[PDB]
Amino acid sequence: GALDVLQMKEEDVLKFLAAGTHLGGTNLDFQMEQYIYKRKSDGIYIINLKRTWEKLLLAARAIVAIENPADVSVISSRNTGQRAVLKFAAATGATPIAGRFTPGTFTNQIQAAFREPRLLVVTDPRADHQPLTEASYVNLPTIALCNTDSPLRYVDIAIPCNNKGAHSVGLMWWMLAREVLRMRGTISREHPWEVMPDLYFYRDPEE
Template identity: 75%
Template sequence: MPLIPELERIIKQEETALSLSLILRFLEAGLPFCTEVEMEQYIYKWKSDSIHIINLKRTWEKLLCAARVIVAIENPADVSGISSRSTGQRAVLKFAAPSGAIPIVGPFTTGTFTNQIQAAFWEPRLLLVTNPRADH
């Protein structure tokens, strides 16, 4: 069975199986829901209680595009993942372990990618950022 129709089937099943307790847990945890106009393309449906359901098909397409970019880099050491916040550090480390990418977790030394005099200077061909606002 092709993957996209299978995803659509799963989306419909999950949409009907989504329980109120799960939604309440998300809200209690303070998980952000889509409020920005740029994110509307990733929304499958809006519920009446202002809960946004993610468009898994669109998200899957973007993940495939990102995977194509990552595998196009010949040397895995030229790929680097960065996360200064603890919420993204585990993801960066889990990505880096099997892929051979270089993880940068925790406090980031300014100038690592730009200051050639610095001992830790290096130029990755691809930089994966978990939170652009925090990891700039």
């Protein structure tokens, strides 16, 4: 949005630059091309950082529009997102799934794990492909974190970022939790937040 109260600050841009979020792959799909700045002299694509913040605020404006927070479902089958989705679901009251998704969880009405959500958020479209393709049987809207070579086939909001691993995946979930809590009125739009980004990251060498 145009508003100064929604503008991206210097201190967020430095946190993007320090985590590698702007660095894509060596390949580009034709659906992702509008999110790209340029290709480097070494064959790597640069993701446009202002495009990310608009698509992330549009995603937060979808997540705030659900009146019961337990109706939102959150997923990661790769390890680099598992701590991050568990912390996101603690900060705001969504339902997490981590590890293997069981086929038929959304469509086998009798099943012990059966559930019926209103919104679905996924960490990587190529890896999390079962809950994406299974959402096509039940009228379920979708948000996803997309790299330059991600296949867009059932996602309705794609957020441009490096999703390969490490600090970049944890930072995106932390920043999405910050803005949903801000615009619902639970924390300040000006005072810094008490939760450090480093709480969401995956398994750097411990000692």
